[PDB]
Amino acid sequence: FINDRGIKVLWEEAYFCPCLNPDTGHPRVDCPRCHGKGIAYLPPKETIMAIQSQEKGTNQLDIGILDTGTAIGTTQLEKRISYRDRFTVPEVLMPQQ
């Protein structure tokens, strides 16, 4: 059922990057292993996931526009997804300006 209904995604697993400043606790902004995010990612894994309610969530602010959109995902069996794990959907292209 999940393999029929889900879209193909690339899953890559989060971990904290060891570039965090030993005093301030913040990421190094020049780190190549993580591009200023505190979180590094393991090599991608192919999986299928079913996704719903794919909202864009436009915001218009004094700083400029931002997207805060949200979606609901149902995983495959026997998986332990972890916080800030990242998905990309290579089939689906979004317009931006």
Partner 1 sequence: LEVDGITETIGTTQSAMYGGASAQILQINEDIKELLDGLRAYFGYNMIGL
Partner 2 sequence: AIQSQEKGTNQLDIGILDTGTAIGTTQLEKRISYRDRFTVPEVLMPQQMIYFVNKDRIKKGIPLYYDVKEITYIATQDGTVYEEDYEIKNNRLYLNEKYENHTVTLKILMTLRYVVSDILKESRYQYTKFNQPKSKFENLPQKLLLKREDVIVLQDPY
Residues that bind Zn ion (CB under 5 A): 17, 19, 31, 33-34
DSSP 45-67: EEEEEEEE-----EEEETTEEEE
74 touches 41 (CB < 8 A): no
Tokens of residue 11, six digits: 């899953």
Q: Which does 97 bind (CB under 5 to 8 A by kind): Zn ion, partner 2, partner 1, none?
A: partner 2
57 touches 70 (CB < 8 A): yes
Figure out which of the listed residues 26, 35, 58, 84 binds partner 2, where binding follows CB under 8 A. 58
Q: Which does 74 bind (CB under 5 to 8 A by kind): partner 1, Zn ion, partner 2, none?
A: partner 1
Binding footprint of partner 2 on the chain (CB under 8 A): 7, 13-20, 22, 40, 42, 51, 53-58, 65, 69, 89, 91-97
